[PDB]
UniProtKB/Swiss-Prot annotation:
<keyword id="KW-0156">Chromatin regulator</keyword>
<dbReference type="GO" id="GO:0001932">
    <property type="term" value="P:regulation of protein phosphorylation"/>
</dbReference>
<dbReference type="GO" id="GO:0010468">
    <property type="term" value="P:regulation of gene expression"/>
</dbReference>
<feature type="binding site">
    <location>
        <position position="228"/>
    </location>
    <ligand>
        <name>Zn(2+)</name>
    </ligand>
</feature>
<feature type="modified residue" description="PolyADP-ribosyl glutamic acid">
    <location>
        <position position="16"/>
    </location>
</feature>
<feature type="binding site">
    <location>
        <position position="235"/>
    </location>
    <ligand>
        <name>2-oxoglutarate</name>
    </ligand>
</feature>
<protein>
    <recommendedName>
        <fullName>Lysine-specific demethylase 4D</fullName>
        <ecNumber>1.14.11.66</ecNumber>
    </recommendedName>
</protein>
<dbReference type="GO" id="GO:0000785">
    <property type="term" value="C:chromatin"/>
</dbReference>
<feature type="binding site">
    <location>
        <position position="302"/>
    </location>
    <ligand>
        <name>Zn(2+)</name>
    </ligand>
</feature>
<dbReference type="GO" id="GO:0032454">
    <property type="term" value="F:histone H3K9 demethylase activity"/>
</dbReference>
<keyword id="KW-0408">Iron</keyword>
<keyword id="KW-0832">Ubl conjugation</keyword>
<dbReference type="GO" id="GO:2001034">
    <property type="term" value="P:positive regulation of double-strand break repair via nonhomologous end joining"/>
</dbReference>
<dbReference type="GO" id="GO:0031490">
    <property type="term" value="F:chromatin DNA binding"/>
</dbReference>
<feature type="modified residue" description="PolyADP-ribosyl glutamic acid">
    <location>
        <position position="17"/>
    </location>
</feature>
<feature type="binding site">
    <location>
        <position position="234"/>
    </location>
    <ligand>
        <name>Zn(2+)</name>
    </ligand>
</feature>
<feature type="binding site">
    <location>
        <position position="300"/>
    </location>
    <ligand>
        <name>Zn(2+)</name>
    </ligand>
</feature>
Amino acid sequence: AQNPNCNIMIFHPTKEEFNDFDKYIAYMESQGAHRAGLAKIIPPKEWKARETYDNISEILIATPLQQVASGRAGVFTQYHKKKKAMTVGEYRHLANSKKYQTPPHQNFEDLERKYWKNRIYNSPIYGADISGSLFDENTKQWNLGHLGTIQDLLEKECGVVIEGVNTPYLYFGMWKTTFAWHTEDMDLYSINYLHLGEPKTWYVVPPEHGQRLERLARELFPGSSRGCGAFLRHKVALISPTVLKENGIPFNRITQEAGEFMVTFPYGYHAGFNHGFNCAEAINFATPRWIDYGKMASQCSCGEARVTFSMDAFVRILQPERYDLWKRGQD
Ligand SMILES: O=C(O)CNC(=O)C(=O)O
Ligand SMILES: [Mg+2]
Ligand code: NI
Ligand SMILES: [Zn+2]
């Protein structure tokens, strides 16, 4: 069995290997990458996403989200308070202001320590989930707006034609902006490209151990767990590495820098934080190996998780027994 300790693997494809996206995902899996839940892909030196980032300031963040924490430093929830619209140029200035800028630090480890110590005492503002793309239309390799769609994959594998579309999303971050512990909708893959700016630190639980994280989460968030049998789908709970280690939960960590891709694998729980002003682009995708994970994915039916139009067909076709209850939660 490849990668039996479930370590995060890092890949350096050549320009030739960067042509066929599906083939390279399958290659990574042949080497055991999926066992970690997360892999890093460093593009060949010949590749670029676009020519420059000098002309992005007029992009609108229609609903910036202020991430307000409750709990203790290693075990907290966050809620998202909606703020007035602002442009990327206004948001970058805000990120760099004395109130929100990254503190002086020695290295990534020192900054990680400061994050876990101090996150709860601040409320950073995240420009998340903005439909759009920063890949040049002429970039033919690993262009996240030109991937094969999940609807087409389900059709190729299972024969059923379904409605829905699959497009990328932009994330504009600042120091302390946080992504809570989650797997993807329908336990899909995700791919994330850090276009510019400061790093993003990730934490991940191997898919084979995801239920250990869930059991801890039910212990640590007992009211939430009573409210919903899949409350991590709400994407609001944080647990620190120190707490994970105290409770024996298997995980790994890695820092992504500008110019790097990360791939999350089906049912790989992940969480993390941004180091300073940055911009990422991400999208969900599927492969043939995903289908069995989609069929078994948990679902939130309490009303909180509320998701895209395109998840309807996935539930309807892969999970017909669950469909009626899930759809009630949507309405
Ligand atoms: O970058 C973020 O805020 C969150 N991204 C992801 O969870 C992802 O790419 O799957
Ligand atoms: Mg612009
Ligand atoms: Ni994710
Ligand atoms: Zn729920």
